Design a protein around this ligand. Structure first.
Ligand code: MG
Ligand code: MG
Ligand code: MG
Ligand code: MG
Ligand code: MG
Ligand code: MG
Ligand code: MG
Ligand code: MG
Ligand code: MG
Ligand code: MG
Ligand code: MG
Ligand code: MG
Ligand code: MG
Ligand code: MG
Ligand code: MG
Ligand code: MG
Ligand code: MG
Ligand code: MG
Ligand code: MG
Ligand code: MG
Ligand code: MG
Ligand code: MG
Ligand code: MG
Ligand code: MG
Ligand code: MG
Ligand code: MG
Ligand code: MG
Ligand code: MG
Ligand code: MG
Ligand code: MG
Ligand code: MG
Ligand code: MG
Ligand code: MG
Ligand code: MG
Ligand code: MG
Ligand code: MG
Ligand code: MG
Ligand code: ZN
Lengths: 156, 98, 113, 206, 112, 50, 46, 65
RNA sequence: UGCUGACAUGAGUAACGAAAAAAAGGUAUAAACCUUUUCACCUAAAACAUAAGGUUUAACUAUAAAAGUACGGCCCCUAAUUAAAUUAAAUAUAAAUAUAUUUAAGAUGGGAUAAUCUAUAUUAAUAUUUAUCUUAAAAUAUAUAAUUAUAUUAUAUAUUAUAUAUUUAUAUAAUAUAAACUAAUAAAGAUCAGGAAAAUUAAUGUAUACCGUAAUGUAGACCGACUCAGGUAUGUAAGUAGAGAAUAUGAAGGUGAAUUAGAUAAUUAAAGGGAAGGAACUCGGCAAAGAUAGCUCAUAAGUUAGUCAAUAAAGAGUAAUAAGAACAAAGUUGUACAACUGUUUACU
RNA sequence: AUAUAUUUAUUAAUAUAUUAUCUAUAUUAGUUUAUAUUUUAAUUAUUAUCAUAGUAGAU
């Protein structure tokens, strides 16, 4: 009667009309999921109609969509998956090197737009204020990497 | 070329100038003269041309009259081979050419 | 190679005026075209809904909960196992999903931090 | 065998009239990787179209990959006649050429620069190219209507992509025409069932 | 080709510091700049005064910065949406702190 | 930071080794920590184990 | 003919020859692994 | 200069701190050949087709009830 | 010529690794970073796409986006080969183990459908290597149906006009450059005789999983202890010229560098020119110099008959006569040894 | 073609300044070239770079 992609589109439309899932629900029923997702800020390359998440490394695209539907009530129409590389890191050169974690980030497309709330001022929020920790780090760098007559050299 | 100077090969115009029947040919697996150890047992054997071994009937069991359809070149033997066709049965087979 | 002796090649064989076909396309682009400055997409055209389900990952629509916005440690306690033991299955399931939601909100924030 | 498809050449109005695969319209495609835009007479495209547009590539404006996933439909613009759509398409190609080769310095001056004097980027995504394409589309359409029933329309991927309905898109000629700025229905996977959606749109205005 | 012995303290020092050729000389040929009453080299321009004049020229003969209209008239929210922030690399950060590795010119003493 | 370490448990053995430093090289470990910390942060009293 | 570049990496080959599972599968490799464990080795194989 | 603050030849690398390191460390998805497929425990979902495709088996797909 | 550590000496000496830089401004902080202009270098690359590799080096943490069609893996299939696996008694064996057979693994290879866009599931039933000539056909001109000379000759698409199903389909006719190149077709020459393995109709399905994707890749991002003139796989590689991927130039793109500025003694290296002479040099013409077409002609003695000798030497035509880019092209002979093309001491 | 001035009855004519000599479609898949169509898409003076200082003759 009709092609496969068209049938799929029709099914999706029907599910939307229903207010049921816009996708075939699986049979492997997870009652108590332990997976968390980190809603990320949007990059320049994305639109207001997209949202990107850090998800579990063993999280499926379909699984994510299901999670978004049932936990939150949001319906992701299209989903992409970006498994990042794990660059080598080490505490110091005396320690063994190992990779940082491969981290899975899934973009979604959604039928209504969204823009984040504006990040707070330094005076307003206590935590979101990068001056202090950065200063502390700088001071640590100065003190450990200070050698001889740079002990007398005044602090930055 | 000076390599051509002493190249003699006997001409057989009646000989077949086509491929052998593919059902009667098996691959001729190369060894380089190496046994199951992987060590050269037989010296001086190596990378020739690719070949197919031909399944030629030495036993000659079936019986009944068979017509020689063609006589071929065979790379794995000095003799020519003759493609027989059984007159009654229609079964095809190779045989050392007389 | 090119040399003193190389005579120039003949010109390519052109097809006569009468024999050449007229091209399928006659009228091309406008000559008046002008490079205008770009038109950057604006939020004014959007109507981001006040109850967009992605707000559920925030708490009171705050980019980050301050120390005052957070629940203090003395006021808050985790559930006791005995307390949980006399709760219904559906209730427990709901509690679990609320917990998970809270973690997600915190996880987003924690990551940012 | 048959080598050429509909996409394999430039198709004039007469060819379209003979065939009638799609209505009189032009398709526009964002590049999710780099932010570059790709115009086409058809809902599909090939390497030939890419070659035609991306003629002078550099580090800033690299010749894009033909991988199908990173290409996504920015805008589907419908017009009153096949000939008109062809003319619009030609105008867009001309504008692109001007920006890349002929009047490149002027275009560069017009763009947004970052510190260290480069055209603003995030990764290899440059958001100026899309903006230029919208501005170029607006220009080409305007020229077409100056040169010059169905009310023409521009089906957008996204309503946000307009600069502003007051500042731009409110010329007298457009208003006279009845240029309806519609958007494509997102009741399904927009990226995956894109071709189906485009077909449905094509069917709608015929 | 090769030293036959450990060269002594005496012999390395008389080699290095004994000859006047190898020593540093006093810069006797300083004199007053007429524009600002400070030390400068003889038969040389004052680096302060010429620098000041160069600065003046820059301030006057200044090619105007190109601010595109469309970016100048963006809303703040809209601008944030379009052009979000980013983490700079370690190298980039190092490059940014120019005062760490870039030497500004010192002023000379006032002549008497 | 720009870390991503906090979303995982990578290089676990190395972390254990660092975390569970031998107690006889505890002065060595804390000497550099003391140096790093400013005067208003640092405390004189010994940071006892859990 | 300049020497020195005798190592010519190719992950697949390395894993075939010196990978953990190759060691495990052979008796000799299993013995090696055991020996490394006894020594105290952090990294038993590629 | 690779970096303008370092005019002279310190023993600093073109990138990173040390070239050398422990080579014997488990592979990731990014490493290896074109044929090297690690996977991330994400998709024991359906079944691989004879032709190279894939067919989801929905009774073996995770819902979050 | 003890071991470890620390610090001297040579010495502020050599060296800073094939290199084209200049100004203005960012910035009254720049030989070295960024921008603009000028200049140069690479250009069948120092470009653009990729493979492998690797401390992610990237245009970066707000990070490399795939149901599939000039998208790869995964998957199906197997090659080379591998396997504490497989078969009262498979066979052999001081143990280890080894052999044969099964099964399983194993890419460097094979794998349906597709812009008209395409649908992969389940159930049921019975292809070494090379070549495209000659003839023949019709076409275009000269001469008087047939001769002479010249190209053309299997496929690839839009247009227009017809005839049949009914503006969508099928077939026919006519219109339309040259030179390379591709794929697919056909016919076929040579001996060295050219992989393996995995069905079709009908009904019922199909909500399309995972992993790769940055940049670098004749290299500062791999292998060489170094940001090492070494080693490193594949495809495009603007035109003008040409037999050509030779050679010159260089449209575009990329680049001009962890050393600079001056001075340029002796001396060294790598180049350019040289009166009169022309091997007198030297173990030795080593080194350097030496090309009067590269196309078309023509080309000897000897000889194993192979234009082997030959790309013969000389020589001719075209071009040039005072000369006036690069690159290809560098004599003739006698003797000793070895038939010849090959192979050899990676580094004398 | 644009910008700035002058005349004329925004237009045309003149003067000065700046920029431009591209582009697109046909000839049966691709590339180049050629011609045709399309477009305002120019041919003389004088320079420079590169090819061993490009080569050569003088100096
Ligand atoms: Mg992916
Ligand atoms: Mg023998
Ligand atoms: Mg798709
Ligand atoms: Mg080594
Ligand atoms: Mg090592
Ligand atoms: Mg790799
Ligand atoms: Mg796939
Ligand atoms: Mg002693
Ligand atoms: Mg000395
Ligand atoms: Mg000296
Ligand atoms: Mg020196
Ligand atoms: Mg400056
Ligand atoms: Mg060459
Ligand atoms: Mg198998
Ligand atoms: Mg393969
Ligand atoms: Mg890559
Ligand atoms: Mg890329
Ligand atoms: Mg590249
Ligand atoms: Mg190198
Ligand atoms: Mg290395
Ligand atoms: Mg070395
Ligand atoms: Mg060329
Ligand atoms: Mg150039
Ligand atoms: Mg490069
Ligand atoms: Mg250098
Ligand atoms: Mg002389
Ligand atoms: Mg002379
Ligand atoms: Mg002598
Ligand atoms: Mg002599
Ligand atoms: Mg010589
Ligand atoms: Mg003779
Ligand atoms: Mg030569
Ligand atoms: Mg010999
Ligand atoms: Mg040797
Ligand atoms: Mg063609
Ligand atoms: Mg013109
Ligand atoms: Mg050059
Ligand atoms: Zn002064």
């Amino acid at each position: 009667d009709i092609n496969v992609s068209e049938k799929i589109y029709k099914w999706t439309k029907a599910g939307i009309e229903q207010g049921k899932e816009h996708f075939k629900v699986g049979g492997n029923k997870v009652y108590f999921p332990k997976a968390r997702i980190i809603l990320l800020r949007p990059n320049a390359k994305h639109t207001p109609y997209q949202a990107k998440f850090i998800v579990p490394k063993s999280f499926n695209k379909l699984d994510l969509r299901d999670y978004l539907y049932h936990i939150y009530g949001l319906r992701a129409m299209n989903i992409t998956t970006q498994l990042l590389h794990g660059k080598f890191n080490r505490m110091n050169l005396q320690t063994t090197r190992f990779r940082e974690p491969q981290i899975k980030k899934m973009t979604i497309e959604m039928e209504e737009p969204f823009i984040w709330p504006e990040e707070p001022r330094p005076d307003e929020n206590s935590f979101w204020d990068s001056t202090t920790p950065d200063n502390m780090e700088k001071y640590r760098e100065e003190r450990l990497n200070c050698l001889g007559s740079d002990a007398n050299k005044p602090g930055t | 070329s000076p390599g051509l100077r002493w190249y003699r090969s006997p001409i057989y115009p009646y000989l077949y100038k086509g491929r052998p029947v593919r059902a009667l040919t098996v691959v001729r697996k190369k060894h380089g003269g190496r046994n199951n150890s992987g060590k050269i047992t037989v010296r001086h054997q190596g990378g020739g041309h690719r070949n197919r071994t031909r399944l030629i009937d030495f036993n000659r069991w079936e019986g009944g009259a068979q017509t020689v359809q063609r006589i071929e070149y065979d790379p794995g033997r000095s003799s020519h081979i003759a493609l027989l066709k059984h007159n009654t049965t229609g079964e095809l087979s190779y045989i050392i050419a007389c | 190679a090119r040399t003193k002796f190389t005579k120039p090649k003949p010109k390519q064989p052109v097809l006569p005026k009468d024999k050449i076909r007229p091209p399928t396309q006659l009228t091309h682009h406008s000559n008046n075209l002008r490079i205008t400055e770009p038109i950057p997409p604006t939020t004014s055209n959007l109507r981001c809904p006040d109850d967009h389900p992605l707000w559920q990952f925030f708490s009171n629509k705050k980019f980050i909960r301050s120390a005052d916005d957070l629940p203090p440690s003395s006021h808050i306690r985790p559930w006791s196992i005995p307390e949980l033991r006399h709760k219904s299955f559906n209730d427990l399931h709901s509690l679990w999903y609320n917990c998970l939601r809270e973690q997600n909100v915190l996880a987003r924030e924690n990551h940012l931090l | 065998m048959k080598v050429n498809h509909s996409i394999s050449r430039f198709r004039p109005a007469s060819w379209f009239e003979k065939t009638k695969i799609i209505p009189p319209q032009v398709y526009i495609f964002r590049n999710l990787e780099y932010g570059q835009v790709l115009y086409s007479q058809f809902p599909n495209f090939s390497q030939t179209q890419v070659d035609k547009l991306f003629v002078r590539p550099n580090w800033s404006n690299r010749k894009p990959s033909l991988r199908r996933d990173i290409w996504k439909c920015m805008c589907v613009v419908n017009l009153q006649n096949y000939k008109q759509s062809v003319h619009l398409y030609q105008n867009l190609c001309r504008l692109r050429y001007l920006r890349d080769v002929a009047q490149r310095k002027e275009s560069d001056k017009l763009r947004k620069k970052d510190s260290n004097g480069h055209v603003w980027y995030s990764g290899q995504y440059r958001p100026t190219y899309c903006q230029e394409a919208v501005a170029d589309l607006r220009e080409s359409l305007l020229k077409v209507f100056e040169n010059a029933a169905k009310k023409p329309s521009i089906y957008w991927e996204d309503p946000w992509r307009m600069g502003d309905k007051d500042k731009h898109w409110n010329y007298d000629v457009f208003n006279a025409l009845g240029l309806e700025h519609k958007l494509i229905q997102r009741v399904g996977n927009i990226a995956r069932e894109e071709s189906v959606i485009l077909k449905e749109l094509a069917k709608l205005e015929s | 080709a090769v030293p036959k012995k450990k060269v002594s303290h005496q012999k390395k020092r008389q080699k290095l510091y004994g000859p006047g050729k190898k020593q540093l000389k006093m810069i006797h040929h300083l004199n007053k700049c007429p524009s600002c009453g400070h030390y400068k080299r003889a038969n040389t321009l004052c680096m302060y005064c010429v620098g000041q004049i160069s600065h003046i020229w820059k301030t006057h003969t200044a090619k105007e910065e190109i601010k595109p209209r469309q970016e100048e008239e963006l809303s703040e929210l809209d601008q944030r949406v379009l052009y979000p922030g980013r983490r700079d690399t370690k190298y980039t950060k190092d490059l940014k702190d120019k005062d760490n590795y870039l030497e500004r010119r010192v002023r000379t003493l006032k002549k008497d | 930071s720009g870390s991503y370490q906090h979303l995982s448990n990578v290089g676990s053995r190395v972390m254990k080794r660092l975390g569970n430093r031998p107690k006889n090289f505890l002065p060595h470990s804390e000497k550099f920590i003391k140096k790093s910390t400013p005067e208003f942060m640092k405390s004189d009293l010994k940071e006892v184990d859990e | 003919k300049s020497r020195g570049n005798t190592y010519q990496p190719s992950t697949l080959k390395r894993k075939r020859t010196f990978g953990f599972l190759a060691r495990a599968k052979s008796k000799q490799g299993s013995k090696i692994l055991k020996r490394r464990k006894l020594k105290g080795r952090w990294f038993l194989s590629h | 200069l690779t970096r303008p603050w370092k005019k002279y030849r310190d023993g600093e690398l073109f990138y990173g701190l040390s070239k050398v390191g422990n080579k014997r460390v488990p592979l990731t998805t990014k490493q290896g050949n074109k044929t090297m497929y690690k996977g991330t425990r994400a998709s024991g979902i359906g079944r691989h087709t004879k032709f190279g495709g894939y067919v989801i088996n929905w009774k073996k797909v995770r819902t979050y009830v």
